[PDB]
């Protein structure tokens, strides 16, 4: 009965990812970053995620991960901004960077 298994959207409970899918990018699954608006994010990298809606076309502007282009990832259920999907890079080609404090962690479904 693990209690730290699944990540859900904090606002609505949509299933988003899993602890098993944490991805250590450059040696750490956690990356502390800031955007041009000065917002600090504690980003957890995941190999896979679900329940999101990726919005727009990819952009390389201000990417926190060298070689990757990003798209905003919203909760597909409630529209909460949960992070970004990264693509266009290498090893892996793609991954998700999700904002840790916008997820709730809990037992499996
Ligand atoms: O890797 C990334 C993801 C996108 C993120 N980003 C933002 O969070 C943001 C907010 C407002 C204007 C422009 C941006 C932007 O590039 C960012 O700065 N780097
Ligand atoms: Zn949600």
XYZ file of C-alpha atoms in Angstrom, residues 11 17 23 40 51 57 76 87 93:
9
model
C -6.447 21.608 -8.196
C 2.434 11.079 -13.543
C 13.853 11.259 -14.811
C 10.997 30.536 -9.598
C -3.785 13.954 -18.477
C 3.915 24.899 -31.130
C -6.219 18.594 -19.374
C 11.025 17.818 -27.283
C 14.266 13.139 -27.227
